[PDB]
Amino acid sequence: SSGHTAFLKAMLSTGFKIPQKGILIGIQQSFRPRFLGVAEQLHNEGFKLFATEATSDWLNANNVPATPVAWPSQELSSIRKLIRDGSIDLVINLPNNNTKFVHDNYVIRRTAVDSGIPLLTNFQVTKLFAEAVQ
């Protein structure tokens, strides 16, 4: 494979650029309790949050606004379309053992990297990305 327009634009970046638009949130259902706090914090900082339907509804039900998106396999807007037109400039995709979503998660991570979008796949990092008031 190769990278294209989105990727080249990323190679022109400085390295200090911090996401501003929206954040796609992908997490295993069972990890919801611990993540809610980080989500709320990201929201309270001006980020628009996007998540797969079930997760988006859970977020909203817990005072954290979020827009639902469809799983690539179940194509609710398309994740690639959002990443493609700049609505999502950061992707949080943490481990998920659900067989039903393993490929979708692979595809989501690959789409982010292919377009030079920062990808957070560890909760530690993600955890500080929010507290840092960043």
Side-chain angles (χ1 to χ4, degrees), residues 101-114:
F101 310 118
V102 169
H103 194 243
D104 279 309
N105 282 311
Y106 170 76
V107 170
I108 290 177
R109 289 182 180 196
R110 171 154 194 52
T111 302
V113 181
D114 277 357

Side-chain angles (χ1 to χ4, degrees), residues 6-101:
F7 191 81
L8 292 185
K9 277 171 168 54
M11 289 305 90
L12 294 180
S13 181
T14 61
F16 291 83
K17 25 66 183 184
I18 298 179
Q20 180 185 304
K21 208 113 303 181
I23 302 173
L24 176 64
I25 295 170
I27 66 181
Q28 186 174 295
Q29 177 177 286
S30 67
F31 193 67
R32 292 181 178 174
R34 182 66 189 79
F35 199 79
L36 187 55
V38 180
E40 189 173 64
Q41 182 157 50
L42 292 174
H43 171 253
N44 299 321
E45 287 307 301
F47 291 106
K48 182 169 186 176
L49 309 182
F50 296 82
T52 38
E53 177 152 294
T55 294
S56 186
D57 294 343
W58 156 65
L59 287 176
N60 288 299
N62 291 80
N63 294 302
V64 187
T67 304
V69 296
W71 281 107
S73 69
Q74 293 167 37
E75 288 176 52
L76 308 179
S77 295
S78 171
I79 292 176
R80 56 175 168 294
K81 288 184 177 66
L82 299 178
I83 287 177
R84 194 173 61 198
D85 71 50
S87 306
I88 289 169
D89 54 17
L90 177 62
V91 177
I92 295 175
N93 192 270
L94 307 176
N96 192 329
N97 55 38
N98 192 330
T99 60
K100 197 182 182 193
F101 310 118

